[PDB]
Design an enzyme around this catalytic site. Structure first.
Site, PDB file in Angstrom:
ATOM      1  N   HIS A 113       0.536  -1.331   0.303  1.00  9.94           N
ATOM      2  CA  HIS A 113       0.140   0.215   0.201  1.00  9.94           C
ATOM      3  C   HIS A 113       1.085   1.526  -0.030  1.00  9.94           C
ATOM      4  CE1 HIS A 113      -3.624   2.793   1.288  1.00  9.94           C
ATOM      5  NE2 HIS A 113      -2.399   3.480   1.800  1.00  9.94           N
ATOM      6  N   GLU A 114       1.420   1.885   0.731  1.00  6.80           N
ATOM      7  CA  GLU A 114       2.482   2.350   1.034  1.00  6.80           C
ATOM      8  C   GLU A 114       3.488   2.355   0.081  1.00  6.80           C
ATOM      9  OE1 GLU A 114       0.609   4.094   4.395  1.00  6.80           O
ATOM     10  OE2 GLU A 114       2.394   4.564   2.887  1.00  6.80           O
ATOM     11  N   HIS A 117       1.494   4.196  -3.183  1.00  7.06           N
ATOM     12  CA  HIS A 117       1.717   5.994  -2.555  1.00  7.06           C
ATOM     13  C   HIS A 117       2.298   6.980  -3.054  1.00  7.06           C
ATOM     14  CE1 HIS A 117      -1.937   6.462  -0.328  1.00  7.06           C
ATOM     15  NE2 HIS A 117      -1.724   5.554   0.627  1.00  7.06           N
ATOM     16  N   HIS A 123      -5.978   6.987  -2.465  1.00  4.43           N
ATOM     17  CA  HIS A 123      -6.426   5.956  -1.628  1.00  4.43           C
ATOM     18  C   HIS A 123      -8.041   5.843  -2.755  1.00  4.43           C
ATOM     19  CE1 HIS A 123      -4.844   7.328   1.975  1.00  4.43           C
ATOM     20  NE2 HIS A 123      -4.563   5.659   1.794  1.00  4.43           N
TER      21      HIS A 123
HETATM   22  C1  LIG Z   1      -2.842  -2.312   3.103  1.00  2.00           C
HETATM   23  O1  LIG Z   1      -1.989  -0.844   3.539  1.00  2.00           O
HETATM   24  C2  LIG Z   1      -2.753   0.335   4.370  1.00  2.00           C
HETATM   25  C3  LIG Z   1      -1.022   1.149   5.012  1.00  2.00           C
HETATM   26  C4  LIG Z   1      -1.714   1.739   6.796  1.00  2.00           C
HETATM   27  C5  LIG Z   1      -3.172   1.961   6.550  1.00  2.00           C
HETATM   28  S1  LIG Z   1      -3.387   3.083   7.660  1.00  2.00           S
HETATM   29  O2  LIG Z   1      -2.565   3.981   8.322  1.00  2.00           O
HETATM   30  O3  LIG Z   1      -4.487   2.592   8.681  1.00  2.00           O
HETATM   31  N1  LIG Z   1      -4.526   4.369   7.231  1.00  2.00           N
HETATM   32  C6  LIG Z   1      -3.275   5.721   6.819  1.00  2.00           C
HETATM   33  C7  LIG Z   1      -4.218   6.720   6.892  1.00  2.00           C
HETATM   34  O4  LIG Z   1      -5.177   7.225   5.877  1.00  2.00           O
HETATM   35  C8  LIG Z   1      -3.483   5.248   4.929  1.00  2.00           C
HETATM   36  O5  LIG Z   1      -4.077   4.978   4.270  1.00  2.00           O
HETATM   37  N2  LIG Z   1      -1.991   5.290   4.695  1.00  2.00           N
HETATM   38  O6  LIG Z   1      -1.248   5.041   3.838  1.00  2.00           O
HETATM   39  C9  LIG Z   1      -4.061   1.535   6.380  1.00  2.00           C
HETATM   40  C10 LIG Z   1      -3.628   0.291   4.947  1.00  2.00           C
HETATM   41 ZN   LIG Z   2      -2.434   5.111   2.859  1.00  2.00          ZN
END
Ligand SMILES: COc1ccc(S(=O)(=O)N[C@H](CO)C(=O)N=O)cc1
Ligand SMILES: [Zn+2]
Ligand SMILES: [Ca+2]
Ligand SMILES: [Ca+2]
Ligand SMILES: [Ca+2]
Ligand SMILES: [Zn+2]
Length: 158
Positions: A113-114, A117, A123
């Site tokens: 996920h990161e 970004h 998102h």
């Molecule tokens: C699957 O990867 C993730 C990574 C981070 C988060 S999170 O920290 O709970 N939510 C944050 C805040 O919006 C997020 O998306 N950070 O990149 C939720 C899922």
């Molecule tokens: Zn995120």
């Protein structure tokens, strides 16, 4: 928004969480990069010294950006889109307990996920997408990007 305008991308692991074996941190991060190189023309290389495109950092509380962490739970990690300096960097909250498995918070899944970004993705509103803002563990050994994730990244690369 911003995207990397080159195919060879470097990353560096700034520091290692004490939550995990060192080799497991390396492998989780490597595998997370591979998810994205699978579906784009990007190539990722780990460097051990110098200025990388993507710096991977474990930190707690205030850590030198406008985005202080909040202790255990809540915000798990965050990252910055492509650009110079802080651009591309991915930060993981050390107040979480990072793991290779379903316990704590899974580093690989969070890193997928990161890094999304770090490559310029925002998102998704779709809970099925890895880019959905809420963490939910799924079996990492059989993990696959959702159609929404693939559409997103291929709108930026290739
Ligand atoms: C699957 O990867 C993730 C990574 C981070 C988060 S999170 O920290 O709970 N939510 C944050 C805040 O919006 C997020 O998306 N950070 O990149 C939720 C899922
Ligand atoms: Zn995120
Ligand atoms: Ca937190
Ligand atoms: Ca950077
Ligand atoms: Ca920790
Ligand atoms: Zn940060």
């Amino acid at each position: 928004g911003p995207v990397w305008r080159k195919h060879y991308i470097t990353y560096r692991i700034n520091n290692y969480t004490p939550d995990m074996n060192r080799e497991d941190v390396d492998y989780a991060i490597r595998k997370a990069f591979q998810v994205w190189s699978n579906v784009t023309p990007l190539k990722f290389s780990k460097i051990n010294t110098g200025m990388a495109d993507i710096l991977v950092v474990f930190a707690r509380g205030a850590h030198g950006d406008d985005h202080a962490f909040d202790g255990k739970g809540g915000i798990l990690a965050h990252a910055f889109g492509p650009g110079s300096g802080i651009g591309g960097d991915a930060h993981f909250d050390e107040d979480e307990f990072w793991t290779t498995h379903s316990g704590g918070t899974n580093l690989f899944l969070t890193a997928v996920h990161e890094i999304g970004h770090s490559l310029g993705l925002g998102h998704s509103s779709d809970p099925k997408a890895v880019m959905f803002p809420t963490y939910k563990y799924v079996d990492i050994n059989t993990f696959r990007l959702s159609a929404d994730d693939i559409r997103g990244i291929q709108s930026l690369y290739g």
